[PDB]
Amino acid sequence: APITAYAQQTRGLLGCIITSLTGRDKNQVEGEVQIVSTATQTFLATCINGVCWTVYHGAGTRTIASPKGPVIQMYTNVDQDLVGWPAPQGSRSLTPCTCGSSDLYLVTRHADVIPVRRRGDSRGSLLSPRPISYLKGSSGGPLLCPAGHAVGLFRAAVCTRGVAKAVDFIPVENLETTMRS
């Protein structure tokens, strides 16, 4: 089946800030990718195998707000730029890619899926370069395979003149290694 996706805003600036200080979020959760924010920035978090993974460069060492108050991170790997909290009650998890495909599709925070060709184990080239502004706020998002399985988590763009020609991602294998640490 074709990979399609949609986004839905669940809260605003004032609600977000209050929920940040409170650490208590009573909203309902749905989806595999959560649009996440801090007072500093907004990025994404992908649920894979019961764990909600995001970028360390965005979440730092913070807790995630939930109905029961803040939830401490389960995994934290500064070197691999990863953090994980148990997947929020309601979220839906993606599952690691097994087929070892090289044709990946990046899901952005605007719910657009863009094809990227895997080059290295942590690099992939956009088949259609886009300005970096398009990709802004997408770190922590998924790089799916044609079967819809997680291959990696977007973390940085390889750009020039303000145009992203390639992307740098965290393959799911580093997640296994991080959990095992």
Binding site: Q8, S20, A65
Partner: peptide, 22 residues
């Protein structure tokens, strides 16, 4: 330091659907 907050979601599990009239 504040907690990371969920401000929205992206759903990949959706499938072509005929939008219903209300």
């Amino acid at each position: 330091k504040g907690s990371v907050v969920i401000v929205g979601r992206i759903v990949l599990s959706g499938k072509p659907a005929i939008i219903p009239k209300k």
